[PDB]
Design a binder for these strands. Structure first.
Ligand SMILES: [Mg+2]
Ligand SMILES: [Mg+2]
Ligand SMILES: [Mg+2]
Ligand SMILES: [Mg+2]
Ligand SMILES: [Mg+2]
Ligand SMILES: [Mg+2]
Length: 190
RNA sequence: CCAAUGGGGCGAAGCUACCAUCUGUGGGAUUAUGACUGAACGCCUCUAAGUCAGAAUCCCGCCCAGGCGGAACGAUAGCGC
């Protein structure tokens, strides 16, 4: 079955300016700008109102798979609003039974060195995605804080570190060592 | 000198032996898999749209040949313009 119309709307905070170049969404906020291209989805984007702006997503004559893309766009656009206003802050804890995991931040938070992971002599060097900054946590021991405006870049950056410290040829239910994503917050709490 | 290389010792050059010696190499997309964001299904979800890492595999490189396939350049005798 094709549905005549399926739509959803997004509310834009006053401090965020959204402009459309076709299906390219440009969100400008206090923390910067994010541009995402949605040309791989056949939807219709509309900006409504002037005082309280809104973004509308329309899908005319959509089957089940095409209808599922309508909310996906809204959620991405909301994350972009969240990124440019509050930012994204993933925290990671390093877990170890015997060998402390030493983390050194280089290149202004764009490179992470991991040493002595399960006692390995090999040094792991993880490169953060552009626009993502890693830093050791002054508040807690054995913790990292990744910050950025793009949720996917920040969360991909953290996945790289988490998968860098993988245990091999052991029972990973026993050998639990590794750095893991422990919290998903925002840079500015508001 | 002859004995169809008379026999035997040592033996140049050449050839030749893991029986001596030397040299044997880099990327790309990715598989399995593990994940990101994320609906579908207000939650969840590696998947649906989008995204990441990924290998004796695969393709290429390096290497071997070099097409009824080209190229630049030289010189061109009764011959070119
Ligand atoms: Mg064992
Ligand atoms: Mg005789
Ligand atoms: Mg001899
Ligand atoms: Mg590769
Ligand atoms: Mg996959
Ligand atoms: Mg890849």
């Amino acid at each position: 079955m094709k549905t005549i119309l399926s739509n959803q709307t997004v509310d834009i905070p006053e401090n965020v300016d959204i402009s459309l170049k076709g299906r390219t969404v440009i969100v400008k906020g206090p923390r910067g700008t994010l541009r995402r291209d949605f040309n791989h989805i056949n939807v219709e984007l509309s900006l409504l109102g002037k005082k309280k702006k809104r973004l509308r997503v329309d899908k005319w004559w959509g089957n089940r798979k095409e209808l599922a893309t309508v909310r996906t766009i809204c959620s991405h656009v909301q994350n972009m609003i969240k990124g440019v206003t509050l930012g994204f802050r993933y925290k990671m804890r390093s877990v170890y039974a015997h060998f402390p995991i030493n983390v050194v931040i280089q290149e202004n938070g764009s490179l992470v060195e991991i040493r002595n992971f399960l006692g390995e002599k090999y040094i792991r060097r993880v490169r953060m995605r552009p626009g993502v900054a890693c830093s050791v946590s002054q508040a807690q021991k054995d913790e990292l804080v990744l910050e950025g405006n793009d949720i996917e870049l920040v969360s991909n950056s953290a996945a790289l570190i988490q998968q860098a410290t993988t245990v091999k040829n052991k029972d990973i239910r026993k050998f639990l060592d590794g750095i893991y994503v422990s919290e998903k917050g925002t840079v500015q709490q508001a």
